[PDB]
Design a protein around this ligand. Sequence first.
Ligand code: NA
Length: 330
Amino acid sequence: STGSATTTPIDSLDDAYITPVQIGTPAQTLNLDFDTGSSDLWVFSSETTASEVDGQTIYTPSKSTTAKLLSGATWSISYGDGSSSSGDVYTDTVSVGGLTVTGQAVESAKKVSSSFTEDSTIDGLLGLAFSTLNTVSPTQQKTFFDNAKASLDSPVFTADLGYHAPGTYNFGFIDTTAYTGSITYTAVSTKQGFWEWTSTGYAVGSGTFKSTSIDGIADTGTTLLYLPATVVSAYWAQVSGAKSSSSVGGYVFPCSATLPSFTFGVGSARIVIPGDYIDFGPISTGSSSCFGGIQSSAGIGINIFGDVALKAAFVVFNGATTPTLGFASK
Ligand code: NA
């Protein structure tokens, strides 16, 4: 089997991407944030505290003929940005892009933090990291990908995120029309439950490539590119008037600037992030200070290749017995 779904930016900055997901029978379609940095499929629901729901579409298990309470199971998650959610668990039929899993754990939120409530466009998350990070207790649950894997034509999914445009998540196949050149594969460590890999270096603009090992994660659920402070300082030093602002919470730059590209290495291959991808616009409405898309990972404890990096590539998440990542230009 295979599946193919379109993923759409939630706003004009590509802050996140939503993908429609069918849950239950008859289908309830919710727009979920597919997150390769977490392992819970959780949704706004008929159980969510009413004051914490503001425009999201909710899953109502009582209206699904295939929903079953997973008795005794609870979940609670905290993300890198300080947001959180928790609740109870149902099993139900879940379909993405025509690919169906029966008996998928659907984590129903009873509580969500303010950042979720305030984002009316995101109805929940679909985690695509390794199932070792799943928060369900007392019986850990599998991801949608882990449950689908054995049925797929190939044990893979791909992320093809757009810059200010829709893109695609595919399950079970490589679309050889969706990228240019060849795919360069690189080793993955699953020790922390993430798609963790080692970049071979970077370049700033037209500058020379610096060969250096940068361990980090491929995380579709993180907006920005978080890298070591040395690399980030080298990038922003090429932008006149750029500075790190403790008041704003990272590097800002004049909105009049033209940003340089950023290149990262994947083995002997190179992925180029155009300068425009690194512009996250005014820090507040009407400001002439703009927020940078490359930020320091110091204090986060891990480097994160978030959407700013991933949307410059066609990315293969290879879930074979020995997992690997692939990157191609597009
Ligand atoms: Na922000």
